Amino acid sequence: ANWEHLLSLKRQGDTAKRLRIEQDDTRLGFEVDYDAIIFSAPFRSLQDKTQVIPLSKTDFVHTRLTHSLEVSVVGRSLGRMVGKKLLEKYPHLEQVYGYKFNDFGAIVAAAALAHDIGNPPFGHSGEKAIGEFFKNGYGKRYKDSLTAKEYQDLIKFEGNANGFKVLSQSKPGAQGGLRLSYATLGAFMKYPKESLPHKPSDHIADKKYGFFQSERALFEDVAQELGLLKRSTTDDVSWSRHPLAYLVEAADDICYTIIDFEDGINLGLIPEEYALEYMVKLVGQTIDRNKYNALQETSDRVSYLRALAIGTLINESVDTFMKYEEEILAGTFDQSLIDKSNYQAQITDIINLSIERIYNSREVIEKEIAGYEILSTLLEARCRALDNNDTHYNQLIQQLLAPKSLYENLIQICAEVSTMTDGKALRNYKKIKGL
Amino acid sequence: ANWEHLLSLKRQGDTAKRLRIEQDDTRLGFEVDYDAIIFSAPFRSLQDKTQVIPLSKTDFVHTRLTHSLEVSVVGRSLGRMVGKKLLEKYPHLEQVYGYKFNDFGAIVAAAALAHDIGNPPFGHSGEKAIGEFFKNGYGKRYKDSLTAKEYQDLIKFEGNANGFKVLSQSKPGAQGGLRLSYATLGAFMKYPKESLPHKPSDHIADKKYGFFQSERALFEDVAQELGLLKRSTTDDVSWSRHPLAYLVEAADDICYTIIDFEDGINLGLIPEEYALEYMVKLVGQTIDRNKYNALQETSDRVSYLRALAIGTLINESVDTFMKYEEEILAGTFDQSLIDKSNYQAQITDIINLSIERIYNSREVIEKEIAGYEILSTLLEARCRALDNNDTHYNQLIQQLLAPKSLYENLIQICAEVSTMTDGKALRNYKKIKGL
Amino acid sequence: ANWEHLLSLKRQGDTAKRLRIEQDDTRLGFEVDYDAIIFSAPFRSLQDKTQVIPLSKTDFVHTRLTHSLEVSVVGRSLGRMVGKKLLEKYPHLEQVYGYKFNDFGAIVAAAALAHDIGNPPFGHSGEKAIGEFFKNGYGKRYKDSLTAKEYQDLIKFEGNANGFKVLSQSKPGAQGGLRLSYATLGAFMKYPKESLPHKPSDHIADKKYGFFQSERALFEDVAQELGLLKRSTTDDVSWSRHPLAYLVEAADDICYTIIDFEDGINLGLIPEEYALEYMVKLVGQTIDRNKYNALQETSDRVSYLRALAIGTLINESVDTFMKYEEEILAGTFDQSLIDKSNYQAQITDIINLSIERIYNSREVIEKEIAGYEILSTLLEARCRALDNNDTHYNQLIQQLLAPKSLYENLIQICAEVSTMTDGKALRNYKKIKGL
């Protein structure tokens, strides 16, 4: 591929090319993208969306908005640092085409900021509850009216794909959604494939899929404009990742690992006695141990460790990207940047500690179990209303929850149930069940 | 038809005639009816029964008892003014028979006071939830054990017909229920027909039905004594309305229109800026503009407009009655009194604004949806216990909720679930669901 | 039967005999049993387990722990008093084998202390909900995969048998459970039979059953060591009760009769006047009338009557036991000790009043109805997770509720659901239901 094409400023529906050298640097398309997301209704709704991790009465624990905000700050740093090195490697990108190192920071930051925008509540358990509804619940009745891939979109409903829908969905008065730059949509697409075939290889980009059938035509346009390399020549389409999607992924990987740990310690789910032991290798060269011992509050000690460890992993991930830059550009890199880390054993240890103390904790399990009932109830009410829209009750349901082809109706129901705020979903659920 | 027979003082089971001229003026049968309703357990229970309209923590919103009381006051005025004009047009009713203008006010007031006594909770949505239970829910299993009209009583369960049952149902030690005058029972019956045929015409009197199969024999006796005109000779019975039922209907129509509007403004669902605009034509000939401007509080200004509009519509309704009095006596008036109003456009505008801002409001929809679940759960508990009364659990349900033919059992279950107070229904529902 | 064998100090797994004369007086096996129950997790859990009797905002009402404690105190007196008379009638028990009167008090106290340890919540209605689950609910699907007696253990699930399971269940690191002395396990077994045949006679010992199929081999060991007399002629096994089981029963009967009455008066469910009227014959010979009239508080007057009445019935039960000692030893006593009471008319009056004012009270019926839903919901969740342990949801359920053969799994599910504390059961129920 070519970096000039990968850094496309095209917005959906454009009729003429947007050259970087002609951009107003105070209205740079990539930076406009970031601000568009910040002010968007879907991003703002993350304020009222918790993570599956429990709340604390005494200490800070991230909601989904502040988690996404911090991921985007890590992403900006990754993009800035790699962008500087790319412009040194390929100086024509700056001298001829006018690209600057902050462009790469803005692309990665915007795609990272919006990564969780489409995820249902209750973490991956919420995805599994939606999928189960269509695999074995009421929604199984729709199988024979859908293509294999349309049905797969439902039984393996994917928040990454719903995020792509949220960013690009046309509505009356708003064609093309947020109309983000194609470079940003490219960096967003960690899994550039459809729902089938399912996990066709052990390649990182094949672990999930990244767009629904409803968004296939758009990503085809995005992939064409960017020049992404093909990974399939059948009607089951798939492409090699945009190089910057590796940085978006690394930002998420760094933040899932270290910031979950930080939250677990502040909640007390992870004993503070383990804080230094698990972070020593990651921070040992830079930690000022005398300073660490002088900090009097648990949360200040763990924030210092988190800052040091994120710094270490950012610097390393930049160097790993540049080492494998040609292979990434050629589509032959089959792993994540963090997979190559010299700290991979320590990262796995932290992740396993978080699985054991946070995600397997009673408070998380209880919430996932409750979430199954909440999501299954909302989906069933919407789907019965779709199937019998004439009855008095189902008209009330439509008025309460949602005031096209079968597939497009079903994927919209999933999309809308997934993006309801915590409070709205809970209130509507309680009314349907009379509580 | 003859007004001498329409004004019957007969009570259920009477052995001898009751002549108006022989009545004690301090114990007039029609006034005794008003007081019997006031002190009755069903009317007292309206204290603990809310309308579908939401509660407010700052302003007055009507419960069902206050609504019924104000309807009865408007009704008394309609009856008084019409009674005076009817006694001028038929002076023998006063000379030979001894009827006085207050008699007509008493009949209309008592019938109007009792109009909502049999309605289930949650408004018309509550009626629909009970019907759905027998149409498509657990109660569907009874269809093949019931006649067409018995089943129709259930799938189209009607609060008007339940009100007639509540007023007249014999119980051990209370033969004939409240034993109201037959004239009052006639004025109560807005839909003098059985559940089938369903809407045989577009006449307002055919829109619903007014008695269940369980009360058909009772209303036949009332219809015979009053000399109501038979409107159909098939096994399907129906009669032309008692003339005073047009005034009972008018009392409800005027209050439903204007007082919902008043509550909507005080709730903030309807902006105050709409209050004068929608009521100027109805009040302009009688309003004291100096008084209106001096009033500094919204609820006082709205209450003033409400009083003037109601007075306007009462006066117009009386004139409309008297214009079509002979048509009403002949059974050939196919319309409501308010349908002939010169302010029909303004009334329709007020009704539509109330639908848009009150009845389609989120708080009303939520409550109606919850009411479906509450009523369906209580009905299913009672019917499962009816079908299998020998189990330990169903014996507990019987002790908790209810400490004859299949049809008579099912209609009683509906009547009882419909008349439980809000708090008792909710408490029993929560216990059944373990909440 | 021989008292030397009936007073066995054997613990499960023992390879050598335990001679009473060799026991350390500060570590007597029978007294060790009492202390082992007190400190056991199942007994401690009765702290957080209420009776079906409603709680009071003004007066004392017993939780299950305090009820079991007071039953054990009454049992200790019964055992001590009968022990002294037994050692007079069989002096070789002391002189040759070294038994002392307090040994009999310790046996009866320990067995009585543990009588309610296995009962499910919600009283006998809780037992009926569990049985109904397997007779007609989801659990009916297991009938054809179980023997007749295995299925009867479920459809007639019995708290007495679950108590035996709780006391003796082997787990890794705790073989034989609490490892109680066999004399104590004999005194505990009021119904020495398996689930089938059901009520083979009207003998009190045949009213219920005392051990599940999972514990049949253990009680067979216990019966052999104690030398209990075989009572059943068929392949369904059954033994005559250990004589001390009659005293454990009498402690329960006396406390349930008088202390329930006491609680009902202090709750206000039973009018205060009924206290002296129903207890005057039980207390007349021993009551200090000036002490009683000087007492100014209801709870103190009633507590005085309770102490006097329990005193009377303890003394009488001891005399009844000794009067029929030889018939009990030979297995020919067909009644309970209290059945032979001279105060049986007063006991029956008190029980019937408690049934009418307490157990048939609205507050109890409400709680039993809710308990059906709670227990049925928990049983269905555990059984569906047993049937499909592979699904993501069922693996969450397994982590939340339970972090071998089909029968062994089902009886363990019943045992665990029955032994959950009130708050733990309610919390898990609410999460499964989304609240």
Q: What does R_g of chain A's alpha carbons equal in angstroms?
A: 22
Phi, psi dihedral angles at B238 (to 5 degrees):
-165, 150
Contact (CB, 8 A) for B190 and B249: yes
Q: Which residues contact B90 (CB under 8 A, 6 or more apart)?
A: B3
Contact (CB, 8 A) for B55 and B107: no
CB atoms within 10 A of CB C239: 24
Contact (CB, 8 A) for C227 and C182: no
Q: How far is C434 from chain B (nearest CA, A)?
A: 11
Query: In B, which residues are within 8 Å of A429 by CB distance?
Result: none
Q: What resolution in angstroms, rounded to 1 decimal?
A: 1.8
Chain pair A-B, CB pairs under 8 angstroms: 41
Can you say how many angstroms the Cα of residue C193 is from the centroid of all Cα atoms in its chain?
Answer: 15
Q: How far is A411 from chain C (nearest CA, A)?
A: 23
Chains in touch with C (≥3 Cβ pairs < 8 A): A, B
Only one residue has tokens 């067409």, namely B148
User: Up-side HSE of residue C261: CA atoms within 13 Å toward CB?
Assistant: 29
**Nearest by CB: C374 against B392, B396, B434:** B434
Which tokens hold the place of C94?
A: 């002391």
Contact (CB, 8 A) for C331 and C231: yes
CB environment B240-262: b (16+ within 10 A), e (fewer):
bbbbbbbbbbbbbbbbbbbbbbb
Query: In A, which residues are within 8 Å of C393 by CB distance?
Result: 128-129, 132, 369, 372
CB atoms within 10 A of CB C289: 8
A312, amino acid identity? T
Q: Could you give the 3-state DSSP secondary structure of residue C168? A: helix
Contact (CB, 8 A) for C131 and C389: no
d(CA C162, CA C158): 6
Contact (CB, 8 A) for C186 and C242: yes
Alpha helices in C229-288 (DSSP H): 245-267, 274-283
Which tokens hold the place of A248?
A: 């978006």
Q: Which residues contact C86 (CB under 8 A, 6 or more apart)?
A: C3, C93, C104, C325
Phi, psi dihedral angles at C193 (to 5 degrees):
-155, 165
DSSP B171: B
Q: Which of A136, A131, A139, A138 is nearest to A155 (CA)?
A: A131
Q: For testing the chain B interface, which of C365, C377, C431, C432 should be mutated: the one with the most B CBs within 10 Å?
A: C365
Q: Could you give the 3-state DSSP secondary structure of residue B21? A: helix
Which tokens hold the place of C153?
A: 């253990």
Q: Does B369 contact A432 at a Cβ distance shorter than 8 Å?
A: yes
d(CA A122, CA A374): 10
Query: In B, which residues are within 8 Å of C362 by CB distance?
Result: 400
Q: How far is C363 from chain B (nearest CA, A)?
A: 10
DSSP string, B213-225: GGGHHHHHHHHHH
d(CA B92, CA B89): 9
Contact (CB, 8 A) for B376 and A432: no
Contact (CB, 8 A) for A267 and A355: no
Let me know the angle formed at the C-alpha of A160 by A158 and A162, rounded to the nearest 5 degrees.
70
C134, amino acid identity? F
Q: Does C434 contact A360 at a Cβ distance shorter than 8 Å?
A: no
Query: In C, which residues are within 8 Å of B400 by CB distance?
Result: 362, 365-366, 369
Q: At what angle do helices B362-387 and B392-401 cross, to 10 degrees?
A: 130
Q: Does C400 contact A369 at a Cβ distance shorter than 8 Å?
A: yes
CB atoms within 10 A of CB A286: 11
B278, amino acid identity? Y
CB environment C341-372: b (16+ within 10 A), e (fewer):
bebeebbebbbebbeebbbebeebbbbbbbbb
d(CA C245, CA C248): 5
Return the residue of A nearest to B377 by Cα: A434
Q: How far is A357 from chain C (nearest CA, A)?
A: 13
Q: Which of C149, C118, C122 is nearest to C46 (CA)?
A: C118
d(CA B252, CA B116): 10
Q: For testing the chain A interface, which of C378, C424, C431 should be mutated: the one with the most A CBs within 10 Å?
A: C431
Kind plus residue range of the DSSP H or E element containing B354 = helix B344-354
d(CA B132, CA B138): 9
Q: Does A373 contact C432 at a Cβ distance shorter than 8 Å?
A: yes
d(CA C429, CA B387): 28
d(CA C234, CA C217): 17
Exposed (0-12), middle (13-18) or buried (19+): which is A299, by Cβ within 10 Å? Answer: middle
DSSP string, C333-402: --S-TGGG-TTHHHHHHHHHHHIIIIITSHHHHHHHHHHHHHHHHHHHHHHHHHHTTTSHHHHHHHHHH-
Chains in touch with B (≥3 Cβ pairs < 8 A): A, C
Q: For testing the chain B interface, which of A391, A392, A428 should be mutated: the one with the most B CBs within 10 Å?
A: A392
CA dihedral A67, A72, A73, A77 (to 10 degrees): 140
Q: Could you give the 3-state DSSP secondary structure of residue C7? A: coil
Chains in touch with A (≥3 Cβ pairs < 8 A): B, C
Beta bridge partners of A63: A50
CB atoms within 10 A of CB A393: 20
Q: Does B397 contact C369 at a Cβ distance shorter than 8 Å?
A: yes
Query: In A, which residues are within 8 Å of C431 by CB distance?
Result: 366-367, 369-370
